[PDB]
Design an enzyme around this catalytic site. Structure first.
Site, PDB file in Angstrom:
ATOM      1  N   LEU A  13      28.149  19.073  61.513  1.00 24.43           N
ATOM      2  CA  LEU A  13      26.862  18.883  60.851  1.00 24.43           C
ATOM      3  C   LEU A  13      26.698  17.467  60.256  1.00 24.43           C
ATOM      4  CD1 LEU A  13      26.622  22.306  58.980  1.00 24.43           C
ATOM      5  CD2 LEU A  13      25.638  21.692  61.205  1.00 24.43           C
ATOM      6  N   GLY A  14      27.789  16.752  59.988  1.00 20.20           N
ATOM      7  CA  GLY A  14      27.706  15.401  59.442  1.00 20.20           C
ATOM      8  C   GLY A  14      29.052  14.800  59.096  1.00 20.20           C
ATOM      9  N   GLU A  15      34.311  15.368  56.899  1.00 23.59           N
ATOM     10  CA  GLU A  15      33.389  15.877  57.913  1.00 23.59           C
ATOM     11  C   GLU A  15      32.851  17.253  57.518  1.00 23.59           C
ATOM     12  N   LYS A  31      33.193  21.475  54.227  1.00 24.70           N
ATOM     13  CA  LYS A  31      33.484  20.042  54.140  1.00 24.70           C
ATOM     14  C   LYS A  31      35.001  19.870  54.148  1.00 24.70           C
ATOM     15  CE  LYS A  31      32.921  15.761  51.573  1.00 24.70           C
ATOM     16  NZ  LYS A  31      33.346  15.175  50.280  1.00 24.70           N
ATOM     17  N   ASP A 113      22.775   9.385  44.230  1.00 19.43           N
ATOM     18  CA  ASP A 113      22.585   8.998  45.640  1.00 19.43           C
ATOM     19  C   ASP A 113      21.515   9.868  46.278  1.00 19.43           C
ATOM     20  OD1 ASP A 113      23.039   7.318  47.861  1.00 19.43           O
ATOM     21  OD2 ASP A 113      24.727   8.506  48.586  1.00 19.43           O
TER      22      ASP A 113
HETATM   23  C1  LIG Z   1      22.023  17.060  60.837  1.00 21.51           C
HETATM   24  O1  LIG Z   1      21.802  18.469  60.750  1.00 21.51           O
HETATM   25  C2  LIG Z   1      22.351  19.150  59.691  1.00 21.51           C
HETATM   26  C3  LIG Z   1      23.147  18.580  58.708  1.00 21.51           C
HETATM   27  C4  LIG Z   1      23.686  19.345  57.669  1.00 21.51           C
HETATM   28  C5  LIG Z   1      24.555  19.058  56.555  1.00 21.51           C
HETATM   29  C6  LIG Z   1      24.731  20.268  55.854  1.00 21.51           C
HETATM   30  C7  LIG Z   1      25.249  20.938  54.709  1.00 21.51           C
HETATM   31  C8  LIG Z   1      26.034  20.404  53.574  1.00 21.51           C
HETATM   32  C9  LIG Z   1      26.505  19.095  53.566  1.00 21.51           C
HETATM   33  C10 LIG Z   1      27.127  18.574  52.443  1.00 21.51           C
HETATM   34  C11 LIG Z   1      27.298  19.337  51.288  1.00 21.51           C
HETATM   35  C12 LIG Z   1      28.099  18.842  50.126  1.00 21.51           C
HETATM   36  C13 LIG Z   1      28.989  17.774  50.252  1.00 21.51           C
HETATM   37  C14 LIG Z   1      29.706  17.300  49.168  1.00 21.51           C
HETATM   38  C15 LIG Z   1      29.543  17.890  47.920  1.00 21.51           C
HETATM   39  O2  LIG Z   1      30.159  17.420  46.801  1.00 21.51           O
HETATM   40  C16 LIG Z   1      28.651  18.933  47.767  1.00 21.51           C
HETATM   41  C17 LIG Z   1      27.940  19.397  48.856  1.00 21.51           C
HETATM   42  C18 LIG Z   1      26.830  20.651  51.316  1.00 21.51           C
HETATM   43  C19 LIG Z   1      26.207  21.174  52.433  1.00 21.51           C
HETATM   44  N1  LIG Z   1      24.851  22.274  54.707  1.00 21.51           N
HETATM   45  N2  LIG Z   1      24.081  22.473  55.833  1.00 21.51           N
HETATM   46  C20 LIG Z   1      23.981  21.288  56.538  1.00 21.51           C
HETATM   47  C21 LIG Z   1      23.361  20.717  57.642  1.00 21.51           C
HETATM   48  C22 LIG Z   1      22.558  21.304  58.614  1.00 21.51           C
HETATM   49  C23 LIG Z   1      22.045  20.528  59.642  1.00 21.51           C
HETATM   50  O3  LIG Z   1      21.156  20.963  60.595  1.00 21.51           O
HETATM   51  C24 LIG Z   1      21.101  22.357  60.969  1.00 21.51           C
HETATM   52  C25 LIG Z   1      21.845  22.411  62.279  1.00 21.51           C
HETATM   53  N3  LIG Z   1      20.943  22.315  63.482  1.00 21.51           N
HETATM   54  C26 LIG Z   1      21.624  22.735  64.746  1.00 21.51           C
HETATM   55  C27 LIG Z   1      22.658  21.718  65.176  1.00 21.51           C
HETATM   56  C28 LIG Z   1      22.045  20.341  65.342  1.00 21.51           C
HETATM   57  C29 LIG Z   1      21.298  19.924  64.089  1.00 21.51           C
HETATM   58  C30 LIG Z   1      20.293  20.977  63.665  1.00 21.51           C
END
Ligand SMILES: COc1cc2cc3c(-c4ccc(-c5ccc(O)cc5)cc4)[nH][nH]c-3c2cc1OCCN1CCCCC1
Length: 254
Positions: A13-14, A15, A31, A113
């Site tokens: 999703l982004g 590791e 994460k 941020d």
């Molecule tokens: C770029 O797309 C996404 C990025 C995401 C990052 C995500 C996170 C996430 C990312 C970082 C944190 C976090 C990180 C550090 C922290 O201290 C506290 C929280 C918490 C959650 N939850 N869902 C997520 C995503 C969903 C995403 O999209 C839904 C998936 N969908 C199908 C696959 C291709 C993209 C679209």
């Protein structure tokens, strides 16, 4: 119940990885990796516009943080370059962003941020503030501490961070929310950084709103941006006053 603690990592999703429960098929964001502070800050958070923290596990050297999965993805991908998005959608996202920031500031946490890449959307397009890796405590035992560390992302940072040794935490997050609103309404960032050397920043301080991105923004939301993107952080509008702004309270429907 056997196997309820087993999670399958299906994709990146982004590791950050999308993980699915072997038994229940519940989806969560994992994460894989300052970490002690980040986990501790997350353990304090409980709000509908803040990504949920389920727990953490340390397997030897790798740290696994279990967080809410937001199937709508990033707010960044709802912004059409050079256009933005419909004004009623931007207002609704901005209302939810203010609810989340009021919550954090109320428990003495600053995100530091805020940007569309860190603002996620759940299945019902509810906004969730995410990534607390640069977050910190700015109020403890009802005593405010002034910040001095350089944190954030230059196009979203407040000018005081580049000009002053010390600064109040809350107006910095307010400023970044104003840049997020500009991006939602115009599909572009107004400057590389808020410095006098930056011509686009100088044009804004000289009220040249006939130029981009400002010329793409309606006068009511632009009047709110005039109050948020104020160089002096002591004169900058506060969140209680943003909630009384005319555009903030304007009924909008596509
Ligand atoms: C770029 O797309 C996404 C990025 C995401 C990052 C995500 C996170 C996430 C990312 C970082 C944190 C976090 C990180 C550090 C922290 O201290 C506290 C929280 C918490 C959650 N939850 N869902 C997520 C995503 C969903 C995403 O999209 C839904 C998936 N969908 C199908 C696959 C291709 C993209 C679209």
């Amino acid at each position: 119940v056997p196997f309820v603690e087993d999670w399958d990592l299906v994709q990146t999703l982004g590791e950050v990885q999308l993980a699915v429960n072997r038994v229940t098929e519940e989806a969560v964001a994992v994460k894989i990796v300052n970490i002690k502070k980040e986990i501790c800050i997350n353990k304090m958070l409980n709000h509908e516009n803040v990504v949920k923290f389920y727990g953490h596990r340390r397997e030897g050297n790798i740290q696994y943080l279990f967080l809410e999965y937001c199937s709508g993805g990033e707010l960044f991908d709802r912004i059409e370059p050079d256009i933005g998005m419909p004004e009623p959608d931007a207002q609704r996202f901005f209302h939810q962003l203010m609810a989340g920031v009021v919550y954090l500031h109320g428990i003495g946490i600053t995100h530091r941020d805020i940007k569309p890449e860190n603002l996620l959307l759940d299945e019902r397009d509810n906004l969730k503030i995410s990534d607390f890796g640069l977050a910190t405590v700015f109020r403890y035992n009802n005593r405010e501490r002034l910040l001095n560390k350089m944190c954030g992302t230059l196009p979203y940072v407040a000018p005081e961070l580049l000009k002053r040794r010390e600064f109040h935490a809350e107006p910095v997050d307010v400023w970044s929310c104003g840049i997020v609103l500009t991006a939602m309404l115009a599909g572009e960032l107004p400057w590389d950084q808020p410095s006098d050397s930056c011509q686009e920043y100088s044009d804004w301080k000289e009220k040249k709103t006939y130029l981009n991105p400002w010329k793409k923004i309606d006068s009511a939301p632009l009047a709110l941006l005039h109050k948020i993107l104020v160089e002096n952080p002591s004169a900058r509008i506060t969140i209680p006053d943003i909630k009384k702004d005319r555009w903030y309270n304007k009924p909008l429907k596509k």
